[PDB]
Amino acid sequence: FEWLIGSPRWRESAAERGDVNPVGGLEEVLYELSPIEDFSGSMSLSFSDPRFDDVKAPVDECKDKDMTYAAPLFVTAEFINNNTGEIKSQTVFMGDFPMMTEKGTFIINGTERVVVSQLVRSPGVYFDETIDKSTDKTLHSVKVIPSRGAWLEFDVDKRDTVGVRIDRKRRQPVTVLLKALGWTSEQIVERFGFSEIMRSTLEKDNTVGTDEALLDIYRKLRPGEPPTKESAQTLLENLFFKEKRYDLARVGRYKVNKKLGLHVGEPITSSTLTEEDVVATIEYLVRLHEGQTTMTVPGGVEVPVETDDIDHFGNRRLRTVGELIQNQIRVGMSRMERVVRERMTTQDVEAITPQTLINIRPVVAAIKEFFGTSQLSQFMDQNNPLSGLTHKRRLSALGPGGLSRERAGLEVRDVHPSHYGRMCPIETPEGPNIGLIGSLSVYARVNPFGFIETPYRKVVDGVVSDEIVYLTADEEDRHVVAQANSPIDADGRFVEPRVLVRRKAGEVEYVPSSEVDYMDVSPRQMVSVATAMIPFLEHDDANRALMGANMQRQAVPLVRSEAPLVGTGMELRAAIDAGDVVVAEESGVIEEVSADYITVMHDNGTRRTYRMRKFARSNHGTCANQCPIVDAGDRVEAGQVIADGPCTDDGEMALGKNLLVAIMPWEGHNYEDAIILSNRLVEEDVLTSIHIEEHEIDARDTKLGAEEITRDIPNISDEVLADLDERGIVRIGAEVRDGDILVGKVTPKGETELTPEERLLRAIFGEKAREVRDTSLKVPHGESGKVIGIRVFSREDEDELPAGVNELVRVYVAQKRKISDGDKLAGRHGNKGVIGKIL
Amino acid sequence: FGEMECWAMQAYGAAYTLQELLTIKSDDTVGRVKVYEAIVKGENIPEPGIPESFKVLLKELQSLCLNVEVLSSDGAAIELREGEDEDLERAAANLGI
Amino acid sequence: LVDRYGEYFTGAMGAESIQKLIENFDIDAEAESLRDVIRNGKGQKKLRALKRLKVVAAFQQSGNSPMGMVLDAVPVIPPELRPMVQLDGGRFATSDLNDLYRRVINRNNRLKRLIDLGAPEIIVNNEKRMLQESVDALFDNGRRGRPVTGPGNRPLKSLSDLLKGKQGRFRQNLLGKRVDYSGRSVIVVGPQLKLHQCGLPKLMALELFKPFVMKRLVDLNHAQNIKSAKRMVERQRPQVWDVLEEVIAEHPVLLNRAPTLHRLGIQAFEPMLVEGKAIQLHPLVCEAFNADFDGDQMAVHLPLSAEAQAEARILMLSSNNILSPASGRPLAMPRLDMVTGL
Amino acid sequence: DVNFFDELRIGLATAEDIRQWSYGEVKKPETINYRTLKPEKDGLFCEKIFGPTRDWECYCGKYKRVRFKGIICERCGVEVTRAKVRRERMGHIELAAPVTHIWYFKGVPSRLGYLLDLAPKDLEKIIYFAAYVITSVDEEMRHN
Amino acid sequence: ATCYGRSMATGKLVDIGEAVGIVAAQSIGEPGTQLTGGLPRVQELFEARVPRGKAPIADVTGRVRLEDGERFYKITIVPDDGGEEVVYDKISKRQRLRVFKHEDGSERVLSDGDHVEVGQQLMEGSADPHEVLRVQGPREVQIHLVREVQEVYRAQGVSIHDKHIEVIVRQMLRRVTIIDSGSTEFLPGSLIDRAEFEAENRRVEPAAGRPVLMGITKASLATDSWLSAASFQETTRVLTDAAINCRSDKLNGLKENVIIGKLIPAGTGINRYRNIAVQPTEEARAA
Amino acid sequence: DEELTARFERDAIPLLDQLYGGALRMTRNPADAEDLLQETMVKAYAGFRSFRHGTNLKAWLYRILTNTYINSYRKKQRQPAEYPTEQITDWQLASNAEHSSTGLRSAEVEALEALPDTEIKEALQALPEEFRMAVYYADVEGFPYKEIAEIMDTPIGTVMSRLHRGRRQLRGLLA
DNA sequence: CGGAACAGTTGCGACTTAGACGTGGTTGTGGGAGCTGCTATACTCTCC
DNA sequence: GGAGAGTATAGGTCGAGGGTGTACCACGTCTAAGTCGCAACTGTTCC
RNA sequence: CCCUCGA
Ligand SMILES: [Zn+2]
């Protein structure tokens, strides 16, 4: 997200990695968009230098008011008249831009959300050799995948013919398209003649000539229309070779470059397919099915001819949050461009300023539609800080641009040798989503092109140095990497002459130490954050280790936390980075401390105060409660933990308690995974947790009238109303059991809905009051607690409500839950069970 | 109570339990009310009626331009409807008129 | 071909032409022709002929005409079966059927409006094609071409989708249903239980038995009328518990754990009022239910009529099925701790 | 209603069948008016054809009572009866042009193809207006 | 009841009205999760599919021309009579020629010029059950199916009593293929129930048919109840076909009784049990 | 005039395959693109006499298309949203019934309401039969005094006296 | 425990309205997103 | 006639908690809300 | 329906 904004932090890190003249995510969208020209070239509009204003509201404000955490976006829009030479430079407000919080989340309509990184296939060229034909003979396929554009497929037939499919269009001899590109039937025989299958295909080609080829191509695309020569050639030009409707990214360009060896001189100029790329693709495929192991192309050098692994992480890419948001920005921005063009013809020049041309509605709407409707924009899972932390580290294969759940085979869900140090092989769901969702490894990074890197130690002349290099999956296959468990002495020399390593395409071998390139920077390098927290993980089978990683994120925050006696050392760094703990940004002395806030006086004389989240409801109903761990007068340092969070104790993740355990059958109550507990854990509240429910109710307009929230509930005893206030809303601090009224509400009832008996009494007693039904909000069955909060929004006031809704009331109930028979306990090793008896 | 749960009931060969689950415990609209009425009065459980989901099935079939009829042994079809007077007669009888 | 000779023949496209070919179709002639080809013919043409005669002979019987394969009128399903509900936030939700019907109505009405304006033949034919496509989508969507999609590119669910599939009417709403007088909870081990008994939480048993309790404490002085009994049970007044103990005696219940792989996945037990919110399962039946006690939950069903109670006591009682119905071997048998103990 | 059910029969429903089932034609795309929250007349939810949404209440409101059971409002055409009829009452649409029932065309094998001895690709070209078909020729006149 | 024998659950003779097909299906399906060949083989057997790794079988006694060259196997059989020579088309070299005991000979592998009996397997592997049906007759296919099916469960440590698999296999051949219609109106090639086939044969037998083996899916969709078949598979297809044929469901099935809310014709729902009349004896009424 | 029809079929129809590709851009759905192009052609043919013979037809038709899409677009934007759903969730049904005039009634509620109300019945029994009939008609069935008098064969004044007196009687009887 | 006489209320029935709301016309360009990363099996069509 | 290809079908059960609206103007056409009178209609009040 | 999760 810092790259999207073009943050100064990103700039410095960009200068550190070296500067390509780095452009932010927004900057790139603005520069590709500019200039916006009239179709006559008479006028132009250009954008530059985007800036973000201050945030509209603080985070907890948006959470309370159902707002979106956002900042106004400003751009400098310069309009130029190509005739008069007059220039108009203006400042335009582009919208309220949803902002990433300090915790790496977004607040959309008050609810906190996470954008999961998406696993997709990078643009490029991928060759697939299928031997599964019924003839038992091997076939060879290829796909050309761009970032945005039209699909192009070449297939050598089971009948021995080279086919072409364009955006699912039906096959034609590969020569048909090549001819239609301006190729003679003879010139194909010059380059492609070495292929006996291409020789057989040109005779099976039904027609020759560029006019008949281009005409046959335009027929395949449009079912019922007329062909035209200049229309079809400009159509084929704009379908592939033009930048507007077809875009290979720089990733796709380089991948095609490296895969075909076309440009060695590293030109960065343009990313689009080329005629030489089509020729190179067919030539690569031609030699492939023949069985050649290498190919050299005119102006190209020594590329192996081989199939590509679809699941390899050099061919598989990660679209991060900044890139997803950038894509939406590009869509809505292109819409705004369309509006500006339509507005250039209508308006009177010198009566136009940019702000009259610029309509920002489709941009804001484009952003809103993403966070609302996208599978990647997700309700944040906060059971405890660990469930929320890994959620932000999730790598998801499902979504737009990804694969459908229906179309995901068992080969996508398997651990892959390119995952090592990149995606954790352990942490992943055990349900239907197994293998479709994964966790970033502890030391992994996402490189600027979307590929995941892992650090390694340079091994020079059999010595293990401290020089660190981040390698991608492709770079890792060229070298020999020793596992971390490989012993080394004080000197860099290996202890053993033979060491088990991964060398080529994920094979494990006893290997000479003499030739070793790199070595793992540590154990746990291949493992996620939650998996790195399992003590003695190496002694647990991968299945129970999976169960352990998922079960830690299901732990409820206890009324009091306790750190484990036995950790892995990951618990502290996990709690701090998760961000549910309060940390001092600057070193100083504690000037004042209470349960409400902590203020630190820096040596500057400037002070900084940290407000405490107190009994806050998480998305899943657990209790987010922060407590200060520091005292007045204490000296603290930058990075030190000031206050504990829900599952933290002294800054280390505490997901449970240390219990005294005996391993033995006891009188059948622990039979088959059932667990027996001491009633001490009930009496001393060691397993007790706080759970906060949100009950919502609104009065709206109905067929027979408007609903009213009231304390006047027909035929209801005054005794049961005793805890309601004067509005009909239950009073703060009341103890509510199932069936008790939280909020009284009445709804208009028609005459026909009265019982004959109810009709008689109302008539003879002269009751003229409105006929109503009791719609009051009541506590659901099996619920109890104390009322800890109330929010009311009225149409009488300026509170913004949906159409037809007069009043909206939320009631928050908090319950203390003692551990009990039927609750589920687990250890970190996958060992689970219900409590069968408490004794 | 799903498909496999019904297989178990059939495997036990318990007909009345399976019929009771799929009519007066779920679908049958007059039966579900008459059953509760019988328990409160301490009487025997009434005989089940027709499940609503079958009438719904017939209607979805007609909407496919399939003409489906439930035929008696006579060979003539059977209208599926309820007399609307029984509820009004009981309500009028409850007031003494 | 119409400009000249147009008075010597008639031709059309669309379904009106197919309706014409059917109207002019001689059924008996084509049937006897097919039978001749089956008799005196051989090879693949004999197969084609037979397969055709299945259809034609099917239509040969009276009361059944091929004309029904072309519709001049499309039926509309009652609205309760395709309802429309208001949502929090002032928005609405409709069944896909309403949107499909809406497309049919819009294209039919536009076809009328084009017929009245004397529109060019190509446009009227376009509207007829679109009407045919929309009635296609309404009946079976996606069966031909690409499906009509609502918001999110989700293809709408046609009238064929109601019947078929695991979520269809047959499988979900007919061969199975949700039922009254049922509950569920997590199961814990019942080691103190006899084989024919199961632990039932107090609140579960009070809800499931609510009418029986109500009548019983109405008969006793506790409740003045049945409605006072209802309100008295909903508040859990202390008088109910004793009464509950009385109404539950020798009244069996059904316990079920999913998936049900065989009939022992449902067994009948005598309920015992038990403290806590968990269902207590006898240790010996865990083989039949495959209950792991790692958080497994089970469901409870209450037999009502004399026949249902009798079936539970006799047919389904836990201690009346000890043996595996597959291999005849013993099923409720010591295992795990018990075995070790012995 | 007990088990007197003997057989259950299907047939093709003729247009006459469909119009006999129907309680009225649905002529309008509108569903319900937002302000009134009441079903638009001659629409998919129309009370006149499908029945009243509230027990014993017609659309105009002239009759709200059981006293009127069985009568049809002169103004709105709704019938005073139970809303239960809204689950048993069907409508219909009269088509400006004939339409094939896709079960009998696109299903494999194509029933229309076997009935008329037509290729399903050709049948498709006809039904979807990509090809003309000859309904009749005059043999005598052409010969003369 | 007597042909079925003991009820494994009660240990006694099976009661009249016990639904033993559902019990058989549950008994076969419940262990299915434990089968790691394997469960796909149980499917391949129950659906009567031509097996992969097909093993040819001899049609008639005679002499064998064994070509078997250039990574290919080809088997011609010249019958002992003047009949035409049957030729098996393609047999891959990955298959093994069967080792067996040749009649009037020793135990050895199949060789060129050998003499073979009628039902001899030409190769080692899975036999096409349809071939063993049309050659060795139905009572042999019963043996082959029950043994090959039970074999998979035995290998996995699961014991199913043979009688369940026998129930399913019984349902697998109820029918005959119509060859010559005769005077009997039966369309040739259709699959007609054996009882109905023998009943429709009236000289005052013209209908010719041969026993069929049909998988459980095809046998299920072939039931006389369009209501039962519509709720199983291919609902669109079944409903179109049933509408065109003006089929009338008789409602006698138990799944149909479930749908319409009628007591299933099994167990306590049988006419024998449900119509029982209960009366107290005179001596008891006295007291 | 038939001149407009022929000239329309020669000039306008070849533009369809163009205009349709435009309609897509607005709808991004093929069905709504078809409907849009068709309504556009309705407007164009109906209004083709207003088009100037030599002027460019493509821009004219394009503007008709856009404007039609906007009429439809603002029209849909004024209405509250209708979301097509494959299935209406049970949560949606209950949530909707919380605001309903009549909620989701259990079989228990239906069975209890159907039971006789004893107090009311016995109180009505104490009334004289005439007062009972009249008060019944009026206060339950809702008859007017005219119709009640027509049914009971008495003057309307009798209906008034019996209504008042039976009502006060029930008031003293039931409290 | 009636039948007029007499005096309070809904309630239907008109009409003015002010605004949402749909209609006139409609004239320089201008052709969508999304995907395709499922397996296995039976059988009609259709190209030959 | 006869073979490939193209299209059709199927793919576990039961539970818990969550879930969305870029785009022409300048106007006449209609409607969505009314305040307001007589009948028509409810009620007392008697003799 | 979809997301995600339990057996
Ligand atoms: Zn009316």
Residue numbers in the entry:
A (entry chain C): 61 to 899
B (entry chain C): 1068 to 1164
C (entry chain D): 244 to 585
D (entry chain D): 3 to 146
E (entry chain D): 976 to 1011, 1026 to 1193, 1199 to 1281
F (entry chain F): 22 to 196
What does the primary publication say about this deposited structure?
After forming a complex with the RNA polymerase (RNAP) core enzyme, σ factors guide RNAP to promoter DNA, open double-stranded DNA (dsDNA) to form a transcription bubble, facilitate synthesis of initial short RNA transcripts, and later assist in promoter escape. The ECF σ factors are the largest family of alternative σ factors. Our structures show that σH binds to RNAP in a similar way to σA, in which σ2 and σ4 stay on the surface of RNAP, and σ3.2 inserts into the active center.
We also report the crystal structure of an ECF σ factor-RNAP transcription initiation complex comprising M. tuberculosis σH-RNAP holoenzyme, a full transcription bubble of promoter DNA, and an RNA primer at 2.80 Å resolution. The synthetic scaffold comprises an upstream DNA duplex (−34 to −10 with respect to transcription start site at +1) with a consensus −35 element (GGAACA), a non-complimentary transcription bubble (−9 to +2) with a consensus −10 element (GTT), a 7-nt RNA primer complimentary to template DNA (−6 to +1), and a downstream DNA duplex (+3 to +13). In the structure, σH4 binds to the major groove of dsDNA of the −35 element and makes base-specific polar interactions with nucleotides at three (−34, −33, and −31) out of six positions. The G−34(nt) makes two H-bonds with R186 through its O6 and N7 atoms; the G−33(nt) makes one H-bond with S182 through its O6 atom; and the A−31(nt) makes one H-bond with M181. The electron density map unambiguously shows that the T:A base pair at position −10 (corresponding to position −12 of promoters for σA) is unwound, despite the fact that the −10 nucleotides in the synthetic nucleotide scaffold were designed to be complimentary. In the structure, N88 blocks the pathway of upstream dsDNA and serves as a wedge to disrupt the stacking of base pairs at the positions −11 and −10. T−9(nt) is flipped out and inserted into a protein pocket formed by the “specificity loop” of σH234. A surprising finding in the σH-RPo crystal structure is that σH2 flips the guanine base of G−5(nt) (corresponding to the (−7) position of σA-regulated promoters) and inserts into a shallow pocket created by σH2 and the RNAP-β gate loop. The guanine base of G+2(nt) is inserted into the “G” pocket in σH-RPo and makes essentially the same interaction with residues in the “G” pocket as the G(+2)(nt) does in the σA-RPo complex.
